[PDB]
Amino acid sequence: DPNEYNEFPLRAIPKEDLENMRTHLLKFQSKKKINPVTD
Amino acid sequence: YIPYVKTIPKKTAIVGTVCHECQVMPSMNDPNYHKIVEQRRNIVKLNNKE
Amino acid sequence: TTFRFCRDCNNMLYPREDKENNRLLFECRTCSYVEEAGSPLVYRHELITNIGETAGVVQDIGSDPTLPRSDRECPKCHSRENVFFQSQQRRKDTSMVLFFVCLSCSHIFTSDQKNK
Amino acid sequence: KVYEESLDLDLERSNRQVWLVRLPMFLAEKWRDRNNLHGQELGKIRINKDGSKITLLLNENDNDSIPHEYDLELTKKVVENEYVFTEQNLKKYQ
Ligand SMILES: [Zn+2]
Ligand SMILES: [Zn+2]
């Protein structure tokens, strides 16, 4: 294919910072737009 | 009000906001394709119990 | 009849009257959200109802092998293939009229010759 | 005195674009392993200039056992009210 695209590299997160830390998904259940930064 | 509530403090931080939801699906035009189909087929054909 | 739902909490609104303007308002019962009604109808109880006559019609209705076929003409695309079925309402008072679904345009027509 | 760190949620890195990706069983079984992810190259994300089509191509490290090309199907172009938050332990002295 021709170079009609902009592909960026993808690499895994180092394990040195993934230990003793848990990353979770937060889901607001509402019909509005909830944004803790401003709201 | 109630004087005591027994909270459990923890260190938390918001480290991103989801903007896209993606579903990774193997391309049907890939030369290695149909090997996953064989692997998927083998899932139902396997009997763990002895 | 159309049901309305609240914007701030998703709870359903209920009718209310405003004597100041003699108008119909739909107000929430928990968070005090109001919205003027677009129609004056708030209730309907159809003792004799025809809802559900063609219930179950999908984009792939013609793929069902148990449905019968017919050679009746489709009065929207002039096609002869179609699958017909009786009314899906199980009340023991409906007529035996047949509803025809075309396999070329997904158009639904009936064989009724009394009222249509 | 019990804790030597702030107990308030850190809303500083929230302005960070994140993609939620659902993986197949074969790909998820090797991408979720904690005995891996040494920072190596897991592939490249390719996006068309005009958009509407995305695909990630893996490297040749798969051992020629799984497809090297995958299509990223955007189940929700506009994802709303979903966030990612971490969890860490607090220093218990002073
Ligand atoms: Zn309300
Ligand atoms: Zn027709």
Curated annotation (Swiss-Prot), chain A:
Present with 1920 molecules/cell in log phase SD medium. TFIIF is composed of three different subunits: TFG1/RAP74, TFG2/RAP30 and TAF14. Phosphorylated on Ser and other residues by TAF1 and casein kinase II-like kinases. It is found in: Nucleus. This is Transcription initiation factor IIF subunit alpha. It comes from Saccharomyces cerevisiae (strain ATCC 204508 / S288c). TFIIF is a general transcription initiation factor that binds to RNA polymerase II. Its functions include the recruitment of RNA polymerase II to the promoter bound DNA-TBP-TFIIB complex, decreasing the affinity of RNA polymerase II for non-specific DNA, allowing for the subsequent recruitment of TFIIE and TFIIH, and facilitating RNA polymerase II elongation. Belongs to the TFIIF alpha subunit family. The gene is TFG1. The lineage of its organism: Eukaryota, Fungi, Dikarya, Ascomycota, Saccharomycotina.
Swiss-Prot record, chain B:
It is found in: Nucleus. It comes from the Eukaryota. Belongs to the TFIIF beta subunit family. Present with 520 molecules/cell in log phase SD medium. TFIIF is composed of three different subunits: TFG1/RAP74, TFG2/RAP30 and TAF14. TFIIF is a general transcription initiation factor that binds to RNA polymerase II. Its functions include the recruitment of RNA polymerase II to the promoter bound DNA-TBP-TFIIB complex, decreasing the affinity of RNA polymerase II for non-specific DNA, allowing for the subsequent recruitment of TFIIE and TFIIH, and facilitating RNA polymerase II elongation. This is Transcription initiation factor IIF subunit beta. It comes from Saccharomyces cerevisiae (strain ATCC 204508 / S288c) (Baker's yeast). The chain holds residues 201 to 250 of 400 of the full protein.
From Swiss-Prot, chain C:
A zinc finger (C4-type) spans 6-31. Keywords: DNA damage, DNA repair, DNA-directed RNA polymerase, Metal-binding, Nucleus, Phosphoprotein, Transcription, Zinc, Zinc-finger. Zn(2+) 2 binds at C74, C77, C102, C105. It is found in: Nucleus, Nucleolus. DNA-dependent RNA polymerase catalyzes the transcription of DNA into RNA using the four ribonucleoside triphosphates as substrates. Component of RNA polymerase II which synthesizes mRNA precursors and many functional non-coding RNAs. Pol II is the central component of the basal RNA polymerase II transcription machinery. It is composed of mobile elements that move relative to each other. RPB9 is part of the upper jaw surrounding the central large cleft and thought to grab the incoming DNA template. Involved in the regulation of transcription elongation. Present with 2440 molecules/cell in log phase SD medium. One of its GO terms (biological process) is transcription initiation at RNA polymerase II promoter. The modification Phosphoserine is found at S39. Zn(2+) 1 binds at C6, C9, C28, C31. A zinc finger (TFIIS-type) spans 70-110. Its main location: nucleus. Component of the RNA polymerase II (Pol II) complex consisting of 12 subunits. Belongs to the archaeal RpoM/eukaryotic RPA12/RPB9/RPC11 RNA polymerase family. It comes from the Eukaryota. One of its GO terms (cellular component) is nucleolus. This is DNA-directed RNA polymerase II subunit RPB9. SUPFAM superfamilies: Zinc beta-ribbon.
